[PDB]
Design a protein around this ligand. Structure first.
Ligand code: FAD
Ligand code: FAD
Ligand code: MWQ
Ligand code: MWQ
Ligand code: CL
Ligand code: CL
Ligand code: CL
Ligand code: CL
Ligand code: CL
Ligand code: CL
Ligand code: NA
Ligand code: NA
Lengths: 454, 454
C-alpha cells in the first residue's frame, strides 16, 4: 500500500496538528501519521499551560509584560545556550499562536487565570480549560476532522525516503505488520516529540538519568524522529540536556498535576515531618532539594481550603484514583492521620504546621520565605501525596533554522525536511522554562506546515 | 631558632586573628605566623560584608530574619551539599561573632545599612565602615597588640611536625632563608585561606578555571594549608567547587568593589550597547551572562546621582585610580563620550538608556525586571568600567568537625590540629553565598582558638 500527499507529518501532538492545519489551510493535501493507537502524545497529557507575553488574559488581569522580558527570561533560563533567533521567533509569534488556538482551533482558555512558572518574571502561562492538554487535543481533533486532515493511527514511521538529489520525498511506515510508503510531494514534517521514555538514549547522553528515574511521558516518546533524521545526516545538538520534573509518581513516573496545589499553598514535607524548601523555588532547586531528603522523596500536603481555590483535585480525578490505589496518596481527616499513613513523626509534623499557620496569618514565612504566602492548614480534610522527580523533557534534538528546515552536519538545508516541537534542539538551551514547550510546539508547528506547503 | 607557644596559628586573616584573640583570652600563649610581609590576607581586601540573622542592624532597620531562614538559604545556595551541622553552627554563632567584633575587637559597622547578597531571602550582611576589610584587619591588629598576641610576618609555614602518637606538636617555617621551629604545646590552627591564586591547584580540581581567568585574591592564597595537612593524612573534600565573581578587572583579576554601584542602579552594558541581564540576578547567573556577551566582558555604567547615594567611588579610590590607569575605567561627562571611549555603538547605548530612564520613572523594568528599581541616567557625569569574571573563592578544603578538629581519611580526629576559614571544605557546599565567608571565618576562627587553647 502507498499513499501520496503534499505534506506528510509524523506525530499527532501540538506540533504535528499545528503543521497539519496550516498545510490544509494553504490548499495542500496532508496527513498525520501517528504510531500509537491514540492521538496527542505528550501534548495530550501535558498541563498545556502556554507562555505568551502580551496576551488577552494578561490584559484582563492588569498584568504588563513584554516580548523583551520573555526573551531574556527564556535565554537566561537555558544558561544563555539557546539560539537567540529561535527564542525571538518563538516569542514574536506567541500571541498569534495563542489567538489562533483560541479563534481557529476553538481552544478555550481561562480568561482570568495564569501560571507563573519558574524563571518567568511575570505571570504569563495561559491555562486551557481543565488544566490539561485534553482540551487542546480534543479541539485540534475536531478541527482536523472538519477541514479534512486525516490522521493514520497505529502507523509508525521507520525510514525517511531520500532521492538522489538529497531531497526527502517520503516516509516508510509500519502498519499492521506491513510497510506502507507515504510519498510527500512537498515536504515531510518531523513532529515526533522527545525521548524521555527511551532509557537507552537517556543513558547515552546523560548517564545519571538511568533506571533510577521514571518518565512523565507516554510510551511513544522514544526519539524516533532524531534517529530517522540522523540516518540521512541531519545534525543534532544539546542531546545531553534533559530535564526532570520534581513532583511525580514514584511508581509510574507520571507527573502529579494534582500537586499543582503547590501554587496555592500546599507544603512539601519530608519523611522527618519537616519543611525543607520554599515550595515555589525554581523547578530544579525543588528537585535537588527532594533528592537531598531521606529516601529521595517528599510529601505534598494540603487541605480542603486550598482545594476550594485551586481545584487541582477536581481537575485531576484520574490521578487521585491512581495515586491512591498505588498507596502514594491518602485523603485524611486530620494531620495526625496524615502522619500515621506515611509513618511521619507526629510531633514534628504538628509543630511544622503550627509554624505554617502562623506564617500564613502574618504573610511572612520565617522558615523558607514562601513568595506568595502560606495558607492555614489547621482544618481538614487533607490530601497527602508521595512524590519524587521523574524525567520530563529532552531539550536537545534536531538542528533547524527559524523556518523549521532541518540542517545537515555542515549546516546545509536538507530539502523537503522540516521539524518542529520537542524533537528540535535549539530553543531551550540547557533548561526549558515551564510553559515554554507549548509555545514552541505551536509556533514552530505552524511554521513547519506553512513552509512544507510552499 | 625555635619558639614555643601553646597555640601556633598559621595565617593572619579573620580566621587566624579570631583564633589568636581567643587563645590569648583563655590565658594561653599564642602566635600567628604569616608568610606575607603584611597582615590580613584576603580578609583585608575583602568587602568584609558579613551575614547575620538577628543583628542589631536588622533591628534598627525593622528587618525580620531567622536562623532557620539563614540556614535554609545557605544550604540551598550550595545545592544541598554543605554539611548541615557546619551550617547550623555557623548560623547559631553569627550574632555572637558580630557582637564580639563590635564589642571586643571594636570593629565599627554601619548601624543602618545592609547588603542582600544573592541567595539571601532578606538583607542580612553587616557592612564594616569603609565597605572593606581594612576596618576589620586594622582593628584586629590593634587589639592583638593590646592583648599581647605576636604576629611573625615574612614567616612561611612549610611542614607540620607530628610526634610518634600522631599528634601535631609544631610547625617548621621559613624566615629570611632559614628554618624556624615553632613548638605548639596545645595546638596548631591552620587558618591559611583558599587557593584562588594557585593556578596549578585550580587546574587540577577544576580544569575550566585555567589561565583564561584571573584571581581576585592576594598572591598568598595558594592552598598551602591543605598541602601541609594532606602530608600528615588530613582529609580534604569539595576541592573542585570553586567560584568566580562576575565584576573584576580584566587586567589584574581584582574584584571591582567600586562596581557595588550595581546594588544602587548601575546598569550592565555589553559591547553592542545593550542591557543583557538583570543587574541583581544571582551571582553565577551574572557571570554566565557576561561570558555569553561579545568578548566575554561587560561594561558597568552609572552616574553622579547613583554615587551620591552609593558612595562606591568615594570608598574605593584606589580602584578608581588603578582601573583608570589600566584603561578599564573612564569618567565622562556624557553618554555619548561613554560610548566613544569603549567603541560602543552610540545610538544603541542612547536607546538603551532612554528605556532605563522610563523604567526608572515607572519602577517597572520591562527588559529585565530589575528587582529594586532603576535610577535615571539622563544626567552625568558617568563612570564606565570594563569587567569580566575572575576566580574568587575555593569552597573545598580540609575536613573538620564543628569543633574545628581536623579529621584524617578515616574520619578520626588528628590530635593537636585545628582548621578554620576558607581552608576548610564543609560549610558552603557547591557554592558559597555572598557575605557567608566572613561569617564562617569569624565563627570558626573563634572556635578553633577556644578548642586549641583547651
Ligand atoms: C505530563 C507532562 C506535562 C507537561 N506540562 C507542560 C506544560 O504545562 N506546559 C508546557 O509548556 N509543556 C509541558 N510539557 C511538555 C510539553 O507538553 C511537550 O514538550 C510537548 O507537548 C511536546 O509536543 P510535540 O508535538 O513535540 O510532541 P508530542 O506531543 O509528544 O507528540 C509526538 C507524537 O509523535 C508520535 N511519534 C513518535 N515517534 C513516531 C513515529 N516513529 N511514527 C509516528 N509517530 C511517532 C508520538 O507517538 C506522539 O503522539 C509537559 C510534558 C508532559 C509529559
Ligand atoms: C577581594 C575579595 C572580596 C571578598 N568579599 C567578601 C565579602 O564581602 N564577604 C564575604 O563574606 N567574603 C568575601 N570574600 C571572601 C572572604 O574575604 C575570604 O574567604 C576570607 O576573608 C578568608 O579568610 P581566611 O582567614 O580563611 O583567609 P585569609 O584572609 O586569606 O588569610 C589567610 C592568611 O594565611 C596566610 N598564609 C597562607 N599560607 C601560609 C603559610 N604557608 N604560612 C603562613 N601564612 C600563610 C596568607 O598569606 C593570608 O594572609 C572576599 C574575597 C576577596 C578576595
Ligand atoms: O513542563 C512544564 O512546562 C510545566 C509542567 C506543569 C506542571 N503543572 C502544569 N504543568
Ligand atoms: O564574596 C562575597 O562574599 C561578596 C563579594 C563582595 C562584593 N562586594 C562586596 N563584597
Ligand atoms: Cl491566576
Ligand atoms: Cl525554573
Ligand atoms: Cl516550573
Ligand atoms: Cl541598606
Ligand atoms: Cl548567588
Ligand atoms: Cl552575591
Ligand atoms: Na528538544
Ligand atoms: Na574552602
Amino acid at each position: 500500500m502507498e499513499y501520496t500527499y503534499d505534506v506528510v507529518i509524523i506525530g499527532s501532538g501540538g506540533a504535528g496538528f499545528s503543521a497539519g492545519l496550516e498545510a490544509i489551510a494553504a490548499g495542500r493535501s496532508a496527513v498525520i501519521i501517528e504510531k500509537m493507537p491514540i492521538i496527542g502524545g505528550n501534548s495530550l497529557i501535558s498541563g498545556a499551560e502556554m507562555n505568551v507575553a502580551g496576551s488577552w488574559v494578561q490584559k484582563n488581569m492588569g498584568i504588563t509584560d513584554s516580548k523583551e522580558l520573555f526573551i531574556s527570561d527564556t535565554l537566561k533560563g537555558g544558561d544563555f545556550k539557546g539560539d537567540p533567533e529561535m527564542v525571538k521567533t518563538m516569542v514574536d509569534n506567541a500571541v498569534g499562536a495563542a489567538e489562533w488556538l483560541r479563534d481557529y482551533v476553538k481552544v478555550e482558555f481561562y480568561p482570568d487565570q495564569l501560571f507563573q512558572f519558574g524563571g518567568h518574571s511575570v505571570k504569563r502561562a495561559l491555562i486551557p480549560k481543565g488544566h490539561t492538554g485534553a482540551e487542546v487535543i480534543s479541539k485540534f481533533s475536531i478541527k482536523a476532522d472538519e477541514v479534512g486532515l486525516p490522521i493514520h493511527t497505529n502507523t509508525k514511521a521507520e525510514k525517511l525516503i531520500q532521492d538522489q538529489t538529497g531531497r526527502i520525498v517520503g516516509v516508510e511506515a509500519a502498519h499492521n505488520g506491513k510497510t506502507i510508503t507515504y510519498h510527500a510531494k512537498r515536504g515531510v514534517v518531523i513532529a515526533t516529540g522527545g525521548f524521555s521514555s527511551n532509557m537507552e538514549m537517556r543513558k547515552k547522553y546523560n548517564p545519571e538519568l538511568d533506571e533510577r528515574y521514571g518518565s512523565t511521558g507516554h510510551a511513544g516518546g522514544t526519539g524516533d524522529g532524531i534517529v530517522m533524521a540522523e540516518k540521512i545526516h541531519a545534525a543534532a545538538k544539546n542531546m545531553g540536556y534533559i530535564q526532570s520534573y520534581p513532583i511525580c509518581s514514584p511508581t509510574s513516573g507520571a507527573i502529579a498535576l494534582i500537586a499543582d496545589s503547590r501554587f496555592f499553598g500546599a507544603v512539601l514535607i519530608n519523611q522527618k515531618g519537616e519543611r525543607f524548601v520554599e515550595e515555589l523555588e525554581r523547578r530544579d532547586v525543588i528537585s535537588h532539594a527532594i533528592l537531598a531528603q531521606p529516601g529521595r522523596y517528599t510529601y505534598v500536603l494540603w487541605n480542603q481550603d486550598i482545594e476550594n481555590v485551586a481545584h487541582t483535585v477536581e481537575m485531576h480525578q484520574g490521578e487521585l484514583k491512581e495515586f491512591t490505589k498505588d498507596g502514594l496518596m491518602y485523603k485524611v481527616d486530620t494531620l495526625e492521620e496524615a502522619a500515621k499513613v506515611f509513618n511521619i513523626p507526629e510531633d514534628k509534623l504538628l509543630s511544622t504546621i503550627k509554624d505554617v499557620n502562623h506564617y500564613a496569618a502574618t504573610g511572612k514565612d520565617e522558615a523558607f520565605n514562601h513568595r506568595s504566602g502560606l495558607v492555614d492548614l489547621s482544618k481538614g480534610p487533607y490530601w497527602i501525596l508521595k512524590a519524587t522527580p521523574s524525567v520530563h523533557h529532552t531539550m536537545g534534538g534536531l538542528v533547524v533554522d527559524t523556518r523549521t528546515r532541518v540542517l545537515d552536519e555542515q549546516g546545509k538545508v536538507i530539502p523537503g525536511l522540516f521539524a518542529a516541537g520537542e524533537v528540535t534542539g535549539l530553543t531551550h538551551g540547557t533548561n526549558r522554562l515551564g510553559g515554554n514547550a507549548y509555545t514552541d510546539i505551536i509556533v514552530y508547528g505552524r511554521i513547519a506546515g506553512q513552509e512544507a506547503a510552499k
